[PDB]
Design a protein around this ligand. Structure first.
Ligand SMILES: CC(C)=CCC/C(C)=C/CC/C(C)=C/CSP(=O)(O)OP(=O)(O)O
Ligand SMILES: CC(C)=CCC/C(C)=C/CC/C(C)=C/CSP(=O)(O)OP(=O)(O)O
Ligand SMILES: [Mg+2]
Ligand SMILES: [Mg+2]
Ligand SMILES: [Mg+2]
Length: 284
């Protein structure tokens, strides 16, 4: 095993550790493509944890600096200040693919501003936040999962990631409340007459369910639109991308089955992921 192989294997470990939902799915891709995804994931994961988990704001500045170094001198050797193995894998990927560097910068700014967390006043603010933390990952992942780097591709990728961030939000309402975060907007929260602190203490009710179902309906609808343009992706990636999404559509059925509980984190069982994959491949 070469050194670079080792760098990608460290990225793989990080994704296996933190992505209980998607590691399984993305590892089904051909080697070159899944190695790039592990790199991207590891970069995004370090960024998202820089502050949330290590509290470390200097570390986040170093990640930005490191990405900035790769963008300007893709071919020079750099003394990476954040995590060397991840940045080497990322520079290796940038020498073969067209990395949307601005998208990592948008993600970094969105993760940063999340330390001045202020509830969204409207859905448009919530949706612009889904772009920043997940539409951007769709954009950076675009040249890896497709040979047609065109606006329709970027656009389905962006729309898929924002859509998964919404499902994510619907799965994590309760744990996000414990961390003092409510991602639903005030406009919509007032309109459905819900106070999350309250529903958290006394259980679900019918206003909360309707609020939640109002957002799940937005996510499901968007899921179906990207499932009609799944062909913008490479042929090897299409069933994986579809598996990734459906796992998350599954999580919504899991929240419904646990009666929208705010006190547990529903997940999808590995065995079930393999089933979903089997069905997708039926028509693939
Ligand atoms: C493929 C494509 C074109 C677009 C999709 C872009 C993606 C994958 C965006 C990320 C969406 C989110 C919120 C993922 C959870 S990461 P996690 O590791 O925390 O997952 P988990 O919390 O275990 O469910
Ligand atoms: C899967 C893939 C290709 C890309 C994802 C890249 C990542 C990790 C981006 C950082 C922003 C996200 C989606 C964090 C997890 S949201 P959460 O509710 O799961 O909270 P968490 O940080 O996981 O505890
Ligand atoms: Mg997670
Ligand atoms: Mg996080
Ligand atoms: Mg969450």
């Amino acid at each position: 095993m070469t050194m670079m192989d080792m760098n990608f294997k460290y990225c793989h470990k990080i994704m296996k550790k933190h992505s209980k939902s998607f590691s399984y799915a993305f590892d089904l891709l051909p080697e070159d493509q899944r190695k790039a995804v592990w790199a991207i994931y590891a970069v995004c994961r370090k960024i998202d944890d820089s502050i949330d988990v290590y509290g470390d704001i200097q570390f986040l500045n170093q990640i930005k600096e490191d990405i900035q170094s790769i963008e300007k001198y893709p071919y020079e050797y750099h003394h990476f200040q954040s995590d060397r193995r991840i940045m080497m894998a990322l520079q290796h990927v940038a020498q073969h693919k067209n990395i949307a560097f601005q998208s990592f910068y948008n993600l970094i700014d969105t993760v940063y501003k999340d330390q001045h967390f202020t509830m969204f006043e409207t859905d448009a603010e919530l949706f612009g936040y889904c772009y920043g933390v997940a539409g951007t990952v769709g954009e950076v992942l675009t040249p890896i999962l497709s040979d047609h780097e065109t606006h329709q591709t970027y656009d389905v990728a962006r729309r898929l990631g924002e859509s998964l961030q919404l499902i994510n939000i619907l799965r994590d309402v309760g744990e996000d409340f414990e961390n003092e975060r409510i991602y639903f907007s005030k406009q919509r929260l007032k309109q459905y007459e819900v106070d999350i602190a309250e529903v958290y203490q006394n259980g679900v009710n019918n206003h909360y369910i309707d609020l939640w179902e109002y957002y799940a309906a937005i996510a499901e609808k968007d899921f179906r639109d990207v499932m009609d343009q799944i062909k913008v992706f490479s042929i090897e990636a299409q069933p994986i991308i579809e598996l990734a999404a459906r796992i998350y559509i599954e999580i919504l059925d899991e929240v419904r089955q646990a009666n929208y509980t705010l006190h547990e984190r529903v997940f999808v069982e590995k065995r079930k992921k393999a089933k979903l994959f089997h069905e997708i491949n039926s028509k693939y």
